[PDB]
Amino acid sequence: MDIQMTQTTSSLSASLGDRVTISCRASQDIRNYLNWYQQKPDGTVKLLIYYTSRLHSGVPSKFSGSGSGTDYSLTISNLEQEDIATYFCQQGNTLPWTFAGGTKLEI
Amino acid sequence: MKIPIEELEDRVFVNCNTSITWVEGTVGTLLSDITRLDLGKRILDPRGIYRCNESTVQVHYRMCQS
Amino acid sequence: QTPYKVSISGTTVILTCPQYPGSEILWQHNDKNIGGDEDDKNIGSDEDHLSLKEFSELEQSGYYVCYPRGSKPEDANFYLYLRARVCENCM
Amino acid sequence: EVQLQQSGPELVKPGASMKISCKASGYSFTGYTMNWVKQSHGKNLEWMGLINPYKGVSTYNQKFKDKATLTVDKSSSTAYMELLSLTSEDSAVYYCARSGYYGDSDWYFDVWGQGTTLTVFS
């Protein structure tokens, strides 16, 4: 009975300078142990936010996270070329740790 | 959280916000008004398990006679 | 739930976590992580045991808590409050 | 700087086994947990398991316990994952990723290797 994570929007197109929000849903309450990762076209992955809203060292303020219970979201402001990537959420509440399918952002 | 254990003067007390459930070990004396369970003199090595309503604490004193 | 096993013998204190058999066990002492590869080599964690060699009453008394890998210290609800002296012929 | 450097791509036939590696630099290997993550179809991510480098004790996702064997070499700061009884369904990119040593931070991955592509075919 592992926790299923879902990101209903598989792909999103936006414009430079815009602000977008990516939704993430858990099948059970994950008590804010929700993290966000950014994967670049070359396959490199970086941590962005952990525990729903804490920014990881080196991550710019344009990234913010929110959510509670089963509903979470990542908000990315002032979009730039460097932000073109796939964003993934992951729950860290119960083993086995699980990830959603990601949202590919094109700008 | 963890249940606070008070060591005042030479006595040991379990301090709960509400009632104090005895689970096993030293029974102690309930001080209902200040919601604390007096486990007695520390030199008597109080040892037991108590629960505040949830958290549980196991107290283990080994003072070697005073 | 089973109680923590508290073994005080000579100058060594050995604590044994109650449950979680088959799981890696982690520990905290007064809200500080211990049992890993830290500077103090007199503190050892093996299986469900935490060994405190040349135990110091002043620095090592306090709250101890164990939890299985996969769990969070913040969620632990069963603590050990240890106040012990390792005097010769303690009896 | 802090980095996880993984071994190169591997091509293997079904039924074979393959051990891939992950070299840590810039930080104390034994002061953090090492995790392995599988990405198939260039999207779907799955946590496979973790290993405590200091103690050499592993904890697996039941889905991959039969498929993987985790180990570490403390002397060289290298983590290994051996993949067993390979099938084409095991073709994917595998990542090693660091997390905290203790439960206060072992559940989010702060440093990721570049990934190792494994392709199983005949």
| Domains of chain B: total | 1
Contact present, D79 and D70 (Cβ < 8 Å): yes
Query: Which of C24, C28, C48, C51 to mutate: most D Cβ within 10 Å?
Result: C24
Q: What is the DSSP secondary structure assignment for residue B44, as one 8-state letter?
A: G
Rg (CA), chain D: 14
User: Which of these CATH numbers, 3.40.47.10, 2.60.40.10, 2.120.10.30, 3.90.226.30, describes A1-107?
Assistant: 2.60.40.10
According to DSSP, the β-strands at D68-73 and D78-83 are antiparallel
Buried b (16+ CB within 10 A) or exposed e, D68-103: bbbebeeeebbbbbebeebeeebbbbbbbbbbbbbb
Tokens linked to D77: 């700061």
- Domain hosting residue B54, numbered range: 1-66
Please say whether the dihedral angle defined by the alpha carbons of residues D40, D45, D46 and D48, taken in this order, is positive or negative: positive
Write down how long chain D is.
Answer: 122
**Contact check, Cβ <8 Å, B63/C83:** yes
Distance in angstroms (rounded) separating the CA atoms of residues A53 and C74: 18
Contacting A with CB below 8 Å, chain C residues are 69-70, 72
Distance in angstroms (rounded) separating the CA atoms of residues A8 and A25: 8
Main-chain phi, psi angles of D89, to 5 degrees:
-65, -10
- What's the resolution in A? 1.9
B29, burial (CB in 10 Å: exposed 0-12, middle 13-18, buried 19+) = exposed
According to DSSP, the β-strands at D32-40 and D92-100 are antiparallel
**Contact check, Cβ <8 Å, A88/D45:** yes
Please list every residue in chain C whose beta carbon sits closer than 8 Å to the beta carbon of residue B57: 78-81
Which residue, chain included where needed, has tokens 């060594």? C12
Distance in angstroms (rounded) separating the CA atoms of residues A27 and A93: 12
Strand, helix or coil at B33?
helix
Instruction: Assess C65–D contact: CB distance below 8 Å, yes or no.
Output: no
Cross-strand pairs, D47: D37
Instruction: Assess C23–D contact: CB distance below 8 Å, yes or no.
Output: yes
Instruction: Assess A53–C contact: CB distance below 8 Å, yes or no.
Output: no
Q: Tell me the CB-side half-sphere exposure of residue D75, using CA atoms within 13 A.
A: 0
- According to the 3-state scheme, what is the secondary structure of chain D? CCEEEECCCEEECCCCCEEEEEEEECCCHHHEEEEEEEEECCCEEEEEEEEECCCCEEEECCCCCCCEEEEEEHHHCEEEEEECCCCHHHCEEEEEEEEECCCCCCCCCCEECCCEEEEECC
- Domain hosting residue C55, numbered range: 1-91
Chains C and B touch (3+ CB pairs under 8 A): yes
Instruction: Assess B3–C contact: CB distance below 8 Å, yes or no.
Output: yes
DSSP result, chain A: -PPPEE-S--EEE--TT--EEEEEEESS--TT-EEEEEE-TTS-EEEEEETTTEEPTT--TTEEEEEETTEEEEEE-S--GGG-EEEEEEE-SSSSPEE---EEEE-
User: Which method was used?
Assistant: X-ray
State how far the alpha carbon of C37 is from the alpha carbons of B33, C42, D52, D78, D111, in Å: 46, 11, 11, 17, 20
Q: Tell me the CB-side half-sphere exposure of residue C60, using CA atoms within 13 A.
A: 21
Distance in angstroms (rounded) separating the CA atoms of residues A76 and A83: 9
CATH tag, D1-122:
2.60.40.10
Of D76, D95, D82, D81, nearest in space to D29 by CA: D76
**End-to-end Cα separation, chain D, in angstroms:** 40
Residue C62 sits in a domain whose CATH number is 2.60.40.10
State how far the alpha carbon of A68 is from the alpha carbons of A28, A52, A104, B30, C18, in Å: 11, 8, 23, 40, 32
Among the partner residues C63, C81, C85, nearest to B63 by beta-carbon distance: C85
Of B57, B44, B47, nearest in space to B5 by CA: B57
| Closest alpha carbon within chain D to C33 | D102
Contact present, D36 and D20 (Cβ < 8 Å): no
A84, burial (CB in 10 Å: exposed 0-12, middle 13-18, buried 19+) = middle
| Closest alpha carbon within chain C to B5 | C81
Cβ-Cβ contacts under 8 Å for B44 (sequence gap 6 or more):
none
Our CA-based measurement puts residue C87 at a distance from the nearest CA of chain B, in whole angstroms, of: 7
Residue B37 sits in a domain whose CATH number is 2.60.40.10
Tokens linked to A61: 């303020």
Report the neighbours of C using a cutoff of 3 or more CB pairs below 8 angstroms. A, B, D
Q: Which helix (H) or strand (E) holds C57?
A: helix C57-60
Query: Degrees (nearest 5) of the Cα angle D122, D60, D7?
Result: 50
Strand, helix or coil at B52?
strand
